[PDB]
Amino acid sequence: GLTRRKLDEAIAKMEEAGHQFTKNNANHYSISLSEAHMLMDAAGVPKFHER
Amino acid sequence: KREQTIENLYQLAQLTQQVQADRIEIVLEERRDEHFPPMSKALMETRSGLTRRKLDEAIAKMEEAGHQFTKNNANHYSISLSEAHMLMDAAGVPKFHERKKNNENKPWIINVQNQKGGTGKSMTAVHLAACLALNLDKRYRICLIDLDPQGSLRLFLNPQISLAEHTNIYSAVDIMLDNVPDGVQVDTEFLRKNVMLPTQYPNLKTISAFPEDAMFNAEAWQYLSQNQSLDIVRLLKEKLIDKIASDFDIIMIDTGPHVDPLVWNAMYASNALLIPCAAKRLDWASTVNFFQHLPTVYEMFPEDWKGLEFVRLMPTMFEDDNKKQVSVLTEMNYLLGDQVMMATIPRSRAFETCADTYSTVFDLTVNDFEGGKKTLATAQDAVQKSALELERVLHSHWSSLNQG
Amino acid sequence: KREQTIENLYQLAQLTQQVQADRIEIVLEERRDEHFPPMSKALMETRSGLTRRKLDEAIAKMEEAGHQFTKNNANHYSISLSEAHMLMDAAGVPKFHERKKNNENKPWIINVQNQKGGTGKSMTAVHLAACLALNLDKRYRICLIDLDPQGSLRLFLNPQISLAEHTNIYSAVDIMLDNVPDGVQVDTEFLRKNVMLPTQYPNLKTISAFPEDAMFNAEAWQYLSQNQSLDIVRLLKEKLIDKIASDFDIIMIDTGPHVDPLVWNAMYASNALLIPCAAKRLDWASTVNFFQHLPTVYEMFPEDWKGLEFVRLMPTMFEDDNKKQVSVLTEMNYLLGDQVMMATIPRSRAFETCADTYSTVFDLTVNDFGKKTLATAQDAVQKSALELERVLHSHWSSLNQG
Amino acid sequence: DWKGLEFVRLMPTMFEDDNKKQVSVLTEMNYLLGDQVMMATIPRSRAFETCADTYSTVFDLTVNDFEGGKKTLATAQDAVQKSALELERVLHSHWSSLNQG
Ligand SMILES: Nc1ncnc2c1ncn2[C@@H]1O[C@H](COP(=O)(O)OP(=O)(O)OP(O)(O)=S)[C@@H](O)[C@H]1O
Ligand SMILES: Nc1ncnc2c1ncn2[C@@H]1O[C@H](COP(=O)(O)OP(=O)(O)OP(O)(O)=S)[C@@H](O)[C@H]1O
Ligand SMILES: [Mg+2]
Ligand SMILES: [Mg+2]
To answer: Residues near B15 by Cβ (< 8 Å), separated by ≥ 6?
Structure first.
């Protein structure tokens, strides 16, 4: 449920760190499930409890 | 000065005489050339619910009778919808207007009103009504009202069939005024004659509407000029509701995207409340305005009416996979839970195809269109489980709202 | 025994004014903190139609003043939208009105009207108007009227950037209702300082709409009871149109989906009608019903308007590949050709983003994020704007002469 | 003996659709002989060049033949076909007039 602009904001906040968004056989960003968790953990979306 | 705009107003004319043409060709083009879907000994099982043994017994009892059964190109049995309702008529299975448990009941008035344009009330509600009519085990006598002067419910393949033989008619307007021949009194026989019409189903019925119905609002402003007690509210109640409550059990009512004197009467006189809506923000904001506007207005209506017994909201055009709209649905379930239906009405190209040929989902089968099967399958199954859950609200309230 | 019913309705209303406040908070979080994406100095040549030498002349005349052409992350001149407006305001290019040849103009008074709803009134009008805004070579001034009681253009990237110098932002109905301090009168000065607000487009303003507008239907019903002269129609025109045409070149009246006293008032007031009717067969049936109803109603009206000027039915949410709907376009073209627009507003997810995010097609750029999808989105929208505004000349020459 | 031609219209061509001068010219034409000039636009793209070089008209070749100048050719053929039906609709409305002269 993250709009494209929100997801680009999240990856602009995240990617400059040491993390690399692992790509599959192609360049397509193959964000692992844990990668997605971390991304939206620090993306700024409050959890169902922390909100 | 207004030489060229005599030209221009009578050229809005010299174009709407060509649109008078256009409607002539529309009538010539919609004309039926179709057959109703057959039950294929498994669709029969799913829809009617009759066991194969009892079905065999009844179709044999009728086979030795005058009527003869019919079969498809293959010897496999195939029975039409007309034959279906005939076997139901002769099944001996009583209706809610014939059941010893409850036969002397009043109409179950069901309405669909939204203040938002083009989002689905017409198509979704006509689909819901034609699906509830699929309750062939019970033979509901259903009155479809296209109170929206521009709805297609008088034209959309469950229609007010105004054949060429149809001589003259007196819409709900003329029932609000008794503008029929002054000599004759409007009795229920008159109502069958020129108000209650079939819908190509021996069970489902309808009323038609016309753009002249817009003149009702002007006449209501005129009556406000000649009246100050807002008594036009009860005009609907006595003219229509008291005359129709004796001999029908359900009345489907579409009202239109608008809130207006006509629609105020529709709101009030009706003894049940349904609220169609989508999952969009602005729609639910309009519903907030609606929930502010009503209470004061109900205070305006006569005190004799002790409020509507139940209030529920609807989905529509619900893509079911958009984050914003599912969040809206969660919020609604968070606020008015148990007063909002869970069932979802999805949007797919199958509905577009249905509309373009005017044919409701039931009128056409897989051979008619592409493999939007499961989409239509789950559409009709959600509409039918939703019909029985709204009718189960009505069941639990057949203690309350029938005694008020 | 309506105690339960009414108190329960108030309980929904009470928990739901909370939802209204929650939406306001969602705005506050979403409030821009940014402005319209700037131009690249090549889109300058493309849309503003100024040759490189002319643009260097303009910036030679301007830049030596206190103004600085703000640069982006790089040295590339990131001329803000307002910066571009000012640049070409004083560059020496005469506006579409100030240009000597055309200064006795009858402004366009456009309508998007369909008594059947869900056909795309507000979004078609706002996409069209916003694209018209970005014709800089002659710096079109545009005007958009949200006259729908449930309308949502207020925060729609023509948003509530409301200079508090205005006494209050009164909605179009509240101009009709006169919910104003009685001291001030309806004058262009009052409108300028108290009514309309900027919309990120110096070429555009809006006349607002709040939920309580719906009661004006009842109010005008009571008025029609008061008198039957039907003069109520002239209210809109006389009070508002004559005074607001001063500051703008093109006027659009979004009548909304209703057919209510408001919209008879508008129909009579409005003198040019677009009909954004998505051609879908049942939509076209409801609009054939439309085309019975309006001839009678218009026939009923008095003798002080120059009718309408044209109709360009723009099929909204169109696809061009759906066999049935493209066929429906063919019947459009055939049954009623010579009166319909050839191009289309193709259905794209960009438009749904436009709608839900309370945005417009142009105020977000490709960098805002789509990609090719929305790129072709505004490509089609801007070709449609070219075609539309060409029709605008084609009948506007008729407007100046009437 | 010839009572003049029953209808007169102008065409676009090579219309880049994004040049200020040429769109201004089109606006002026629509300003002068409106209803007597087609609205439809014929854009210019490398797809037409490829078509010409192999001699093959847009219909003779498909996406597999060339690059992704798809939508360009798509909107080219669709503008040409809606323009064909609008010129033939001029001819329809004039199948009263010019057939009887
Ligand atoms: N499932 C659907 N598939 C396709 N179109 C749909 C669907 N549901 C609604 N529509 C749209 O709705 C139009 C006609 O149906 P309605 O929405 O009922 O019109 P309406 O009578 O104004 O009802 P409202 O105001 O939208 S609730 C169609 O032309 C579509 O644009
Ligand atoms: N692509 C789309 N994305 C989202 N909403 C759309 C789209 N196309 C049409 N709509 C509908 O249009 C609404 C907003 O635009 P408008 O159609 O102008 O609203 P409006 O003022 O009610 O006029 P109507 O009733 O739709 S003709 C949305 O809330 C939807 O119901
Ligand atoms: Mg409707
Ligand atoms: Mg309008």
So the answer is: C339
Resolution, in Å, please? 4.5
Nearest CA to ligand 2 atom 30: C118
User: Judging by DSSP bridges, how do beta strands C250-254 and C108-112 pair with one another?
Assistant: parallel
Residue B198 host element (H or E):
strand B197-198
Q: Which residue is associated with the tokens 């323009």?
A: D83
Q: Which amino acid does the sequence have at C100?
A: K
Which residues in chain B touch residue A2, judged by CB atoms under 8 angstroms apart?
323
d(CA C397, CA C401): 7
Q: Is A26 left (phi over 0), alpha (psi -120 to 50) or beta?
A: beta
Ligand 1 centroid to Cα of residue B361, in Å, is 15
Interatomic CA distance for residues C324 and C382, integer angstroms: 26
Q: Whose CA is nearest to atom 29 of ligand 1?
A: C283
Residue B241 gets which letter from DSSP? I
Neighbours of chain D (3+ CB pairs under 8 A): C
Whole-angstrom distance, CA of residue C21 vs CA of residue C25: 6
Taking contacts as CB-CB distances below 8 angstroms, the residues of chain A near B323 are 1-2
Q: Do B16 and C280 touch (CB under 8 A)?
A: no
> Measured between alpha carbons, how far is B229 from C300 in angstroms, rounded to an integer?
29
How many residues are given for chain D? Answer: 101
Buried b (16+ CB within 10 A) or exposed e, B152-176: bbbbbbbbbeeeeeeeebbbbbbbb
Residue where the block lists tokens 């039906």: D85
Exposure on the CB side of residue B164, measured as CA atoms within 13 A:
4
CA–CA separation, C86 vs A37, rounded Å? 47
Nearest to C276 by CA among C204, C370, C201, C351: C351
CA B2 to chain centre: 46
- Phi and psi at residue C144, in whole multiples of 5°? -130, 130
Which residues have beta carbons under 5 A from ligand 3 (an ion)? B 257
Say which amino acid occupies D45. S
Cβ-in-10-Å burial (0-12, 13-18, 19+) of B316 comes to buried
- Structure method: cryo-EM
Q: Are D22 and D15 in contact (CB under 8 A)?
A: yes
- Please answer whether residues C318 and C278 qualify as being in contact, where contact means their C-beta atoms are separated by less than 8 angstroms: yes
Separation CA B29–CA B15 (nearest Å): 20
Among the bound ligands, the one closest to the CA of C274? 4
Kindly identify which residue of chain B lies nearest to residue A2, measuring between CA atoms.
B323
Query: What type of residue sits at position D2?
Result: W
Phi, psi at A6, each rounded to 5°: -60, -40
Please tell me the distance in Å from B316's CA to the nearest CA on chain C: 13
